[PDB]
């Protein structure tokens, strides 16, 4: 599924991400835009052999099991394919574990480079929330 901007904002709000660990909703929407272009089916392979999955591009070296990343942890205890669903619940629940691990949203390279320090409220402007 490819989400609309306000549709995703609303879905993330219902799932408890607005101000989760102090990150306002616009941060999560901005990160999704530049990680996946709001496409739940997005996958990208990394140089080390791991792969990133879903709307928030969660990596198989630490967070999920894809059966092909040797030595990986599955810290979210989920197959990586569950992260590609039109239902964002599994991605959101895993993202909450990631953002709580010490480095906040700096875990997402595109957030650090394209959202951090910008007017992220613009990503939810106009939405009925
Ligand atoms: Cl915001
Ligand atoms: Cl980047
Ligand atoms: Na929309
Ligand atoms: Na893994």
UniProtKB/Swiss-Prot annotation:
Residues at the active site: 35, 52
Tissue distribution of the protein: In the egg white and polymorphonuclear leukocytes.
UniProt: substrate binding residues: 101
Gene3D superfamilies (UniProt xref): 1.10.530.10
Sequence ranges assigned to domain C-type lysozyme in this UniProt record: 1-129
Keyword Disulfide bond (UniProt): yes
Cited function: Lysozymes have primarily a bacteriolytic function; those in tissues and body fluids are associated with the monocyte-macrophage system and enhance the activity of immunoagents. Has bacteriolytic activity against M.luteus.
Protein name as catalogued: Lysozyme C
Gene coding for it: LYZ
């Amino acid at each position: 599924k490819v989400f609309g901007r306000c549709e995703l904002a609303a879905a993330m709000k219902r799932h408890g991400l607005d101000n989760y660990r102090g990150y306002s909703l616009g941060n999560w929407v901005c990160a999704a835009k530049f990680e996946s272009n709001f496409n739940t089916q997005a996958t990208n392979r990394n140089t080390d052999g791991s792969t990133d999955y879903g709307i928030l591009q969660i990596n198989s070296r630490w967070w999920c099991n894809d059966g092909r990343t040797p030595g990986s942890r599955n810290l979210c205890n989920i197959p990586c394919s569950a992260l590609l669903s039109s239902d964002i619940t599994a991605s959101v629940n895993c993202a909450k574990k990631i953002v709580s691990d010490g480095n906040g949203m700096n875990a997402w390279v595109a957030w650090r480079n394209r959202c951090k320090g910008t007017d992220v409220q613009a990503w939810i402007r106009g939405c009925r929330l």
